[PDB]
Design a binder for this molecule. Structure first.
Ligand SMILES: CC[C@](C)(O)C#Cc1cc2c(cn1)cnn2-c1ccnc(N)n1
Length: 290
């Protein structure tokens, strides 16, 4: 879409593409007013998708919370809509690729899991589901105060599950899924309305992939095939080389439906007890700091 050295609205000079192909394209850009590098996400106003407006709404509702990028600006024209946000470092999928065996140490995996769980709690606390939890949607900070912090990205698939009063809206009988196949829960595969527990299913799949390097359905492209494996796969065997406490995490989320609030502290305890058991210190160096 936007070429290099294109200047959005005479302020944001495109430098490179850093991601795209989903509901949007995101660029690293130079903010010519502040002279600071920023992230610039663009959506064609001609796409079927019309999401960036709610990305900003979610983004400003989470402003100030940890693991959330700062909103810098947004705008629209006849060709595309855009949002400008704080630039973060490399994403967790990139970092996992660049590890020699495609795996993180358990020290990194468990401490990442704690941070991602916190950000999932955060967006759930403002009444929104993420619905596209995956490694490429999390990135480490890029500043001296943020580089050991994980940042939640891409609210383009987010949906409000509460209403104005804090009550939970009824789920639809069916809901289309337009997210990423690899880390979707079986509920998502079955076009069921996603709930808070489905964001946690994605976290569970992420952490298994981090520690083990792969998921059984890694190569499989056909979505509707992928759901069939997950529906038939015995998930306890994913935990062969995970800490034993992950059985509690698996058992809990497998028990949930759309209507039941997750026991977030149970999952947090699984991570924290796993770390204490291996003597993993919170301030230990991450794998890529090595
Ligand atoms: C988070 C709010 C919003 C507007 O919904 C979004 C988004 C978004 C950001 C994305 C990507 C996809 N979507 C891919 N990379 N990336 C990066 C990479 C480096 N820094 C930053 N800030 N974002």
């Amino acid at each position: 879409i936007l070429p290099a050295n294109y200047v959005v609205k005479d302020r944001w000079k495109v430098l490179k593409k850093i991601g795209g192909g989903g509901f949007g394209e995101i660029y690293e850009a130079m903010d010519l007013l502040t002279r600071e590098n920023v992230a610039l996400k663009v959506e064609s106003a001609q796409q079927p998708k019309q999401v960036l407006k709610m990305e900003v709404a979610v983004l400003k509702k989470l402003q100030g919370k940890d693991h959330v990028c700062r909103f810098i600006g947004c705008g629209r024209n006849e060709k595309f809509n855009y949002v400008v946000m704080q630039l973060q470092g490399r994403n967790l999928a990139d970092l996992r690729r660049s590890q020699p065996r495609g795996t993180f140490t358990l020290s990194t995996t468990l401490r990442l899991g704690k941070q991602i769980l916190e950000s999932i709690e955060a967006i759930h606390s403002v009444g929104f589901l993420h619905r596209d939890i995956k490694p490429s949607n999390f990135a480490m900070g890029r500043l001296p105060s943020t580089y050991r912090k994980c940042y939640m990205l891409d609210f383009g698939l987010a949906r409000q599950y509460t209403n104005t009063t804090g009550d939970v809206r009824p789920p639809r009988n069916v809901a289309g899924f337009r997210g990423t196949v690899r880390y979707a829960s079986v509920n998502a595969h079955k076009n069921r309305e996603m709930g808070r527990h489905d964001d946690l299913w994605s976290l569970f799949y992420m952490l298994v992939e981090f520690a083990v390097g792969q998921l059984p359905w890694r190569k499989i492209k056909d979505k509707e095939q992928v759901g069939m494996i997950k529906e038939k796969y015995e998930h306890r065997m994913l935990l062969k080389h995970m800490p034993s406490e992950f059985h509690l995490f698996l058992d809990h989320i497998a028990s949930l439906d759309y209507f039941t609030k997750p026991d977030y502290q149970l999952i947090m305890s699984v991570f924290e007890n796993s770390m204490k058991e291996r003597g993993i210190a919170e301030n230990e160096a991450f794998d890529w700091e090595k």
